[PDB]
Amino acid sequence: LDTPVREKDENEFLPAHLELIETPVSRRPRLVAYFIMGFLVIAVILSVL
Amino acid sequence: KFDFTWFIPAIIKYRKIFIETLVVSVFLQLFALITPLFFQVVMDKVLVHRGFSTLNVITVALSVVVVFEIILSGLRTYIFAHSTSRIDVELGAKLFRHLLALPISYFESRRVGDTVARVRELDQIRNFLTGQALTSVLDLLFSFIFFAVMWYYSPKLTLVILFSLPCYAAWSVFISPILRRRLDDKFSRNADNQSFLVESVTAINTIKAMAVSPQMTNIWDKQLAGYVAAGFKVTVLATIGQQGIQLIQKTVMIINLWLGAHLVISGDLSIGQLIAFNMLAGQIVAPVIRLAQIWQDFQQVGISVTRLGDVLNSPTESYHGKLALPEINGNITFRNIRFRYKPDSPVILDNINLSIKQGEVIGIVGRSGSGKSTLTKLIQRFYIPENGQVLIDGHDLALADPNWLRRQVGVVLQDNVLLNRSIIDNISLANPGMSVEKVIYAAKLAGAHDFISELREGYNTIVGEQGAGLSGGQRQRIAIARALVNNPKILIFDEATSALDYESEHIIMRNMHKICKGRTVIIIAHRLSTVKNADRIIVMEKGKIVEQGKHKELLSEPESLYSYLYQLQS
Amino acid sequence: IWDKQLAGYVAAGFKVTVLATIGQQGIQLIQKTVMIINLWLGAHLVISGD
Amino acid sequence: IDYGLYALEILAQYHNVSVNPEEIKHRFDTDGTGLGLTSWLLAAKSLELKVKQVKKTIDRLNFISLPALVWREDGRHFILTKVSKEANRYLIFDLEQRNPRVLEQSEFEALYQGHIILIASRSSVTGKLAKFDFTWFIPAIIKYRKIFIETLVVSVFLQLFALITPLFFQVVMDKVLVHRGFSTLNVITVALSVVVVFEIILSGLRTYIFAHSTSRIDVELGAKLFRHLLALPISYFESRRVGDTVARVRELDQIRNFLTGQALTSVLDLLFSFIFFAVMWYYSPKLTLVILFSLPCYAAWSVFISPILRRRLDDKFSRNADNQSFLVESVTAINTIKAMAVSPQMTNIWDKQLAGYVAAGFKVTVLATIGQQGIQLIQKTVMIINLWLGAHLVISGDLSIGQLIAFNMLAGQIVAPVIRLAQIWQDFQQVGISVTRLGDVLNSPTESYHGKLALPEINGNITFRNIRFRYKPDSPVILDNINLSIKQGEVIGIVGRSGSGKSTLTKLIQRFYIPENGQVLIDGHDLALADPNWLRRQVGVVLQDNVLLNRSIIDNISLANPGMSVEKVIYAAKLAGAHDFISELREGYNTIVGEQGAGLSGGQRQRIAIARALVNNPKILIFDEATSALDYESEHIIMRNMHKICKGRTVIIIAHRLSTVKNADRIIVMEKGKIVEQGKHKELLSEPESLYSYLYQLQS
Amino acid sequence: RSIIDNISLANPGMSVEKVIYAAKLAGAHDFISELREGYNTIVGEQGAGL
Amino acid sequence: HGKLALPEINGNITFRNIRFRYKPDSPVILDNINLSIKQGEVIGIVGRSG
């Protein structure tokens, strides 16, 4: 959690890589869907109980 | 030591207004406490029993209470900011006065951007002080009135809040140090970036005269990527802290809801009492929420204070205040001086012994590496000799006031650095309120009036940079005028004619008898034709005196190295 | 020169802070007035009905 | 000797400001022999340091910051430094007997008079490019903020006052008539009398205060306008007409007539009409909705009509400016009009211009009338709709007759300021035009050459360096490669044929002509960006034809410094040979010279101009064909006094006749823009193969 | 006005032939011609341009 | 303007009617400098200051 900035973290913000990468995606692409479906299934199993 | 005890005298000096701010804060807390009582009264005795006149009374009282509370809060914020502005002004003045008094070895071992960033930390501190961070601390501290009222209402829920507070304290204690470390890393990267930017903008002429844009751009890209990564880490930690605070707030909110529902069900608590208790609990937590989103401000002001301490804890070459030693007559003498650039560097001077009388134009010559160039930096107390003493007018320079000595002595170097101001602003730097006629006379003495005549703007021409916009000879003539426009008892010419052509040098040498009138002038130059009209010429070899005397007294004998040097020069 | 410039900078910063505080207080005043009006109207609505 | 000037110089030197006493004395000591407190404070503020003359007792001098100037009414000022209560002594820099000296308490009490001036310096004004426009009035409003806050308070209280009368009418109608309620009508009558008296008094006070403050703002604007106007380059005035600038300045009087009027008070009353809106919404929302829908109709009508009125007023102002230019040019040159008998042509031109002007004015009047009638139509339509709706809303209960008439009165009170604004629509548009045309003058590059160099006095060292000059960009070149150098105290003569270019050197030395290539240097300083007041104050130029101001003989001679003693004016007149005919006049001196010297002859004005140029003691004196309009006696007097005239000056004598420059230390012959020969008189005359010899033989 | 308008001030409707004749008689033809605008040069206010 | 990639440089320098000023209205430094330097040629340029 308190790890210093490494080269892996530094390369994500290198302007050359950002220039090459077109149509960029988020670092957490499917987490929102996972959490929303988890909320929906927890709600539906709470409603039946 | 400047860490945090420096602000205590500032607080106590302004104690009579800070106590007033504290009393205004407690009155604001009382004003805030008033309103939930009015909601409880409305919910328990207006909605239940009867009547609308009591509702009108509550509304009309609440309107003026709210207006007064808003005005009082604004006044408290204004007064606190006004009081802290004076403290930050005092800190800034002290910081700059300390910065100007530091020794030259401090600046020679560092970069410009480092000091610039350490001084922008002053602006960071000023923004922290003149803000709404300490007012939130006051609001949080003065919330025990709410606790007393809540304990009057219900002890169980008050105990729940009282146990929630240590959760906030422990969460802050746990999540603070890592944020401070990340902000330390971010500040280090920011200082490096500022230093690179200053260095690249200052030397843009060489960057563009050469073709190294790609190298500079690559370095800038890497530095920017690192800095933004550090900033993102700091943002992530701040967000984690804020969400951790919100979790505790909502958990205790839910627990209070459950316990209050069970309480109201079992009697011994009305619904309006529960609503007022909930509003009081929210008003207690609101300062914590408002303080949890300025966490970076707290850690950054701590780090800025640490960096200001780093600047302000170094020793100063400040002053020697003893009897206010009088003016200088141009009597310089050296007694067994040996000097070393570093303690682990070869020796330059070994047993240089010298004595110069008032009004004596003395020339010092030699070859590269002879060590004649260090005498000018030794006369000013910049270079400290290994052992020996440098005496000016009988008084040791190691115990005298540096500013006094360096004010009495004027030095012209091989290359001189001006400021980004007008020509007259550079000539009269030591006394800007000085008469223009003196500036014109000094410029005419140095031969600088002629080349200024072909300038469209005249003496108002702004030197583009340290020396940009003027040639080398023009800069040398401007520096000579700046040295001469005062009344220096000692003049030093340290290859001050290398950049000049034959005509400008001839014009300067014709005025040399007006320049040397009543002053002790020391001429140091590679060429032997400049010290021809000197009262005494001195030859140095590897830090030792091998020959001295008049030019002919030395030119007559071919056995001397002076004759060999003159033959090579011709 | 530094003292003059620092004094000017601090004065400008204080003016900015003062106007920011004034704006925040005005928005708080609007919010609180709306709260009072809603409390009064809601009291009438709950006493009457609907 | 002036002690205020020396004290200001010392205090500016202490605060790191460089000051030339002569420049300050030039622009802040108009009336000679004494600065004075107000001009001293203005001069101190000119150097960007704040000062204030304050009331301080002797016991409070230990807390003020030093140095401070002690202003004495006798004119013998002194500077106080380092007040010490250790020995109750006061260190003081004595202006007279320049060295400092220490004084005890007893004699400080004798010197001190309870007057002291505090001096301090704080940064400077950041550079900006603020073109003149309506945004110029924002800082003036900020400066006069206390008065405007007072005006806002009075306006809101007046609006509250106007709300009482409809309420009183309602209570009278609803209770007094119904219940036969006497002893209530009396209370309403007394309260109404009090209310109307107080509202009348408050309206009068608001008008008084607002008019006073707007008059002060207009005074500031006019002072700024004239100061800008006098600093414009001469090429600005050479391409315009007098009437154009005169009209552009009278637009300031138009602005003044606007500011001290009912327009802004009517606007203030208009913005404060929501207080009535709340009450009328309390009465009945059905008619307040009609009023709220009516207001956008007013706004749309005004927005539609304004641009056309602005265009018509642009045309009207163009007509007015051309008419003023024609009138000024025809009255100024009335002698030529009478002599040439060209009255019919002037009358025809005047008739055409007057007819066009009246047509434009009539068009503006018609458009304003139709706009006012359009606003009346909306007002009356809303009135009819409200009458119908009120009749229905009274027939079915829910509203009373007194409430209805109170609503009608409130609606009338709301709409009345709109009507009175519509009555002065032309004033609003004309003020917009006035501001634009005033900015047409206030937005122009001035040659004032603002800076902080403060160049010293002039030694008469003139130098031309590769001078090339064209009258206009497409004109043929007048001077090709003039290279000249004149030393101090050197009497010099320039001769040649007409068109050679000798006549433009006078206007090159002064910064009236800008060379195409090269630079003119005085004392080594390039004049291209120097202060014009620094240069032209120390250069005395006598032209072939000079003009005077209708003030007096002595006021024309000593115009540049009215502080000259009568003895110096008499001496200057004697040198020029003008004292003889001045003394024999009916009034002697103090004689009005008329419009550009009408009462004086053409050869007398030349001597008056010579005396005027001599009285100011210039460092460089130029005689540009001065003695060509005089007879033999006056010219002989001038040449005999030339030896006293030329003492201590760099004198340049440009003349057609070679006999004028015979005694010059160095003669320059010019031909078609080139210096072909130069030397002494005998050196140049002894060569028959030159141009000077040919010109001397031809004229002899 | 222009040179030709001033020369023909006493009768604004006059042909260039008489203007040329009068200018030759007065000896001003040459200088006016040497100008760029010729007889159409504006003299300025009160003939300040000449 | 040229987006094309010019080839490498041979040492042929040519000044064609060069006129230069430091500022928009400052005195002319170079009036009509015309020069031509061939490849591999050593050129010495001397003169007074200014």
Short mmCIF file of C-alpha atoms in Angstrom, two decimals, chain D residues 223-436:
data_model
loop_
_atom_site.label_atom_id
_atom_site.label_comp_id
_atom_site.label_asym_id
_atom_site.label_seq_id
_atom_site.Cartn_x
_atom_site.Cartn_y
_atom_site.Cartn_z
CA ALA D 223 -8.99 66.64 -16.71
CA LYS D 224 -7.75 63.28 -18.00
CA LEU D 225 -9.12 64.05 -21.48
CA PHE D 226 -7.34 67.39 -21.74
CA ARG D 227 -4.08 65.99 -20.36
CA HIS D 228 -4.22 63.25 -22.99
CA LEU D 229 -5.10 65.76 -25.72
CA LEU D 230 -2.12 68.03 -25.08
CA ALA D 231 0.26 65.04 -25.21
CA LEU D 232 -0.75 63.80 -28.68
CA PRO D 233 1.81 63.99 -31.51
CA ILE D 234 1.59 66.92 -33.93
CA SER D 235 0.84 64.58 -36.85
CA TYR D 236 -2.48 63.86 -35.13
CA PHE D 237 -3.51 67.51 -35.27
CA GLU D 238 -2.04 68.04 -38.75
CA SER D 239 -4.44 65.52 -40.32
CA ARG D 240 -7.63 66.66 -38.53
CA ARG D 241 -9.69 69.84 -38.35
CA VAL D 242 -10.19 72.04 -35.30
CA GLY D 243 -13.96 71.52 -35.22
CA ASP D 244 -13.55 67.74 -35.11
CA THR D 245 -11.54 67.85 -31.88
CA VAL D 246 -13.78 70.59 -30.48
CA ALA D 247 -16.87 68.42 -30.95
CA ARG D 248 -15.05 65.38 -29.57
CA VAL D 249 -14.40 67.45 -26.43
CA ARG D 250 -17.94 68.88 -26.16
CA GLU D 251 -19.14 65.29 -26.01
CA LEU D 252 -17.70 65.51 -22.48
CA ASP D 253 -20.25 68.24 -21.75
CA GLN D 254 -22.89 65.89 -23.16
CA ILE D 255 -21.73 63.19 -20.72
CA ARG D 256 -21.86 65.70 -17.86
CA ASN D 257 -25.43 66.66 -18.77
CA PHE D 258 -26.29 62.96 -18.68
CA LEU D 259 -24.66 62.14 -15.35
CA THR D 260 -26.34 65.00 -13.46
CA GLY D 261 -29.80 63.91 -14.55
CA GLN D 262 -32.74 61.63 -13.76
CA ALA D 263 -31.65 58.74 -16.00
CA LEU D 264 -29.56 56.82 -13.47
CA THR D 265 -32.00 57.53 -10.63
CA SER D 266 -34.80 56.20 -12.84
CA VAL D 267 -32.73 53.07 -13.55
CA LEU D 268 -32.13 52.59 -9.82
CA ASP D 269 -35.86 52.94 -9.17
CA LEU D 270 -36.44 50.37 -11.92
CA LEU D 271 -34.18 47.69 -10.44
CA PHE D 272 -35.78 48.17 -7.00
CA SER D 273 -39.34 47.38 -8.18
CA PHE D 274 -39.48 43.75 -6.98
CA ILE D 275 -40.57 45.00 -3.55
CA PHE D 276 -43.81 46.01 -5.24
CA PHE D 277 -43.87 42.67 -7.05
CA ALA D 278 -43.97 40.74 -3.78
CA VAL D 279 -46.95 42.76 -2.53
CA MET D 280 -48.88 42.44 -5.79
CA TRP D 281 -48.23 38.69 -5.84
CA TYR D 282 -49.61 38.63 -2.29
CA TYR D 283 -52.76 40.33 -3.59
CA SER D 284 -53.34 38.14 -6.64
CA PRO D 285 -50.89 36.10 -8.76
CA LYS D 286 -53.24 36.28 -11.77
CA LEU D 287 -52.40 39.94 -12.50
CA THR D 288 -48.81 39.82 -11.28
CA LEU D 289 -48.36 37.17 -13.98
CA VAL D 290 -49.66 39.69 -16.53
CA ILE D 291 -47.12 42.26 -15.31
CA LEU D 292 -44.29 39.70 -15.37
CA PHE D 293 -45.22 38.82 -18.96
CA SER D 294 -45.44 42.52 -19.87
CA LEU D 295 -41.86 43.23 -18.78
CA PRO D 296 -40.26 41.08 -21.56
CA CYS D 297 -42.33 43.06 -24.08
CA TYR D 298 -40.71 46.26 -22.80
CA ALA D 299 -37.28 44.66 -22.99
CA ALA D 300 -37.82 43.35 -26.53
CA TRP D 301 -39.18 46.69 -27.76
CA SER D 302 -36.21 48.57 -26.28
CA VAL D 303 -33.72 46.08 -27.75
CA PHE D 304 -35.35 46.32 -31.18
CA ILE D 305 -35.47 50.14 -31.21
CA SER D 306 -32.04 50.97 -29.71
CA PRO D 307 -29.71 50.07 -32.64
CA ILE D 308 -31.67 52.13 -35.18
CA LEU D 309 -31.62 55.15 -32.87
CA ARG D 310 -27.88 54.65 -32.38
CA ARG D 311 -27.30 54.63 -36.15
CA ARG D 312 -29.41 57.76 -36.62
CA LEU D 313 -27.48 59.50 -33.85
CA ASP D 314 -24.19 58.46 -35.48
CA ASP D 315 -25.35 60.19 -38.66
CA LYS D 316 -26.51 63.21 -36.64
CA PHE D 317 -23.15 63.49 -34.87
CA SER D 318 -21.32 63.28 -38.19
CA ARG D 319 -23.47 66.15 -39.47
CA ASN D 320 -22.86 68.14 -36.28
CA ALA D 321 -19.08 67.61 -36.36
CA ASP D 322 -18.84 68.67 -40.01
CA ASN D 323 -21.00 71.73 -39.32
CA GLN D 324 -18.80 72.69 -36.35
CA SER D 325 -15.64 72.27 -38.43
CA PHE D 326 -17.06 74.45 -41.21
CA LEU D 327 -18.17 77.11 -38.72
CA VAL D 328 -14.80 77.24 -36.94
CA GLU D 329 -12.85 77.34 -40.21
CA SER D 330 -15.07 80.09 -41.67
CA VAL D 331 -15.02 82.30 -38.56
CA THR D 332 -11.25 81.90 -38.07
CA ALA D 333 -10.57 82.90 -41.70
CA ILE D 334 -13.33 85.52 -41.94
CA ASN D 335 -10.84 88.11 -43.21
CA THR D 336 -10.10 85.99 -46.29
CA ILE D 337 -13.82 85.37 -46.85
CA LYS D 338 -14.53 89.10 -46.78
CA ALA D 339 -11.50 90.00 -48.92
CA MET D 340 -12.19 87.44 -51.66
CA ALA D 341 -15.97 88.12 -51.62
CA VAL D 342 -16.85 84.43 -51.43
CA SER D 343 -19.89 84.95 -49.22
CA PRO D 344 -22.40 83.25 -51.61
CA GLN D 345 -20.36 80.03 -51.73
CA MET D 346 -20.08 79.94 -47.93
CA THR D 347 -23.82 80.56 -47.57
CA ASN D 348 -24.63 77.76 -50.03
CA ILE D 349 -22.38 75.33 -48.16
CA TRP D 350 -23.92 76.38 -44.85
CA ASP D 351 -27.45 75.92 -46.19
CA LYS D 352 -26.67 72.42 -47.45
CA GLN D 353 -25.03 71.40 -44.16
CA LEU D 354 -27.82 72.89 -42.04
CA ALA D 355 -30.50 71.17 -44.10
CA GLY D 356 -28.76 67.82 -43.71
CA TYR D 357 -28.32 68.34 -39.97
CA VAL D 358 -31.98 69.24 -39.48
CA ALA D 359 -33.09 66.24 -41.54
CA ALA D 360 -31.01 63.91 -39.35
CA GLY D 361 -32.39 65.50 -36.19
CA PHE D 362 -35.96 65.13 -37.41
CA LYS D 363 -35.38 61.46 -38.24
CA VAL D 364 -34.04 60.88 -34.72
CA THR D 365 -37.04 62.69 -33.22
CA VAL D 366 -39.51 60.63 -35.25
CA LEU D 367 -37.87 57.35 -34.25
CA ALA D 368 -37.86 58.34 -30.57
CA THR D 369 -41.54 59.30 -30.79
CA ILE D 370 -42.55 55.97 -32.30
CA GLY D 371 -40.56 54.15 -29.61
CA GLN D 372 -42.31 56.08 -26.84
CA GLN D 373 -45.70 55.38 -28.41
CA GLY D 374 -44.83 51.69 -28.67
CA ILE D 375 -44.10 51.59 -24.95
CA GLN D 376 -47.35 53.46 -24.22
CA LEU D 377 -49.22 50.83 -26.23
CA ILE D 378 -47.87 47.96 -24.12
CA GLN D 379 -48.62 49.86 -20.90
CA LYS D 380 -52.22 50.55 -21.90
CA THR D 381 -52.84 47.02 -23.22
CA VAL D 382 -51.66 45.60 -19.89
CA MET D 383 -53.91 48.14 -18.18
CA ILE D 384 -56.98 46.95 -20.12
CA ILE D 385 -56.18 43.28 -19.51
CA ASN D 386 -55.74 43.97 -15.79
CA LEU D 387 -59.02 45.90 -15.66
CA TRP D 388 -60.92 42.99 -17.22
CA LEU D 389 -59.26 40.35 -15.04
CA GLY D 390 -59.73 42.47 -11.91
CA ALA D 391 -63.41 42.99 -12.67
CA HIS D 392 -63.87 39.22 -12.89
CA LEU D 393 -61.66 38.63 -9.83
CA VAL D 394 -63.77 41.10 -7.82
CA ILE D 395 -67.18 39.91 -9.03
CA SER D 396 -66.45 36.38 -7.76
CA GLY D 397 -65.09 37.36 -4.35
CA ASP D 398 -61.44 36.47 -3.71
CA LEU D 399 -60.58 40.17 -4.15
CA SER D 400 -61.86 43.53 -2.87
CA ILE D 401 -62.23 46.90 -4.59
CA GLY D 402 -59.63 48.51 -2.34
CA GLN D 403 -57.21 45.69 -3.10
CA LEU D 404 -57.92 46.14 -6.81
CA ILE D 405 -57.15 49.86 -6.80
CA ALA D 406 -54.08 49.30 -4.62
CA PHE D 407 -52.88 46.78 -7.21
CA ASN D 408 -53.51 49.33 -9.96
CA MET D 409 -51.52 51.98 -8.08
CA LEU D 410 -48.64 49.55 -7.51
CA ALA D 411 -48.60 48.63 -11.21
CA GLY D 412 -48.55 52.32 -12.15
CA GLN D 413 -45.68 52.95 -9.74
CA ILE D 414 -43.77 50.07 -11.32
CA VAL D 415 -44.36 51.21 -14.90
CA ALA D 416 -43.71 54.95 -14.37
CA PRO D 417 -39.87 54.71 -14.28
CA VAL D 418 -40.04 52.84 -17.60
CA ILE D 419 -42.02 55.75 -19.05
CA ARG D 420 -39.56 58.36 -17.78
CA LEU D 421 -36.69 56.26 -19.13
CA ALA D 422 -38.43 56.15 -22.51
CA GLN D 423 -38.71 59.95 -22.44
CA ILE D 424 -34.88 60.16 -22.40
CA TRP D 425 -34.03 57.34 -24.82
CA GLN D 426 -32.20 59.79 -27.08
CA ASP D 427 -30.04 60.78 -24.11
CA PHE D 428 -29.00 57.16 -23.48
CA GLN D 429 -28.05 56.56 -27.11
CA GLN D 430 -26.30 59.93 -27.41
CA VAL D 431 -24.27 59.12 -24.30
CA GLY D 432 -23.15 55.85 -25.85
CA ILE D 433 -22.12 57.86 -28.91
CA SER D 434 -20.37 60.42 -26.70
CA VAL D 435 -18.32 57.74 -24.95
CA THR D 436 -17.33 56.18 -28.28
#
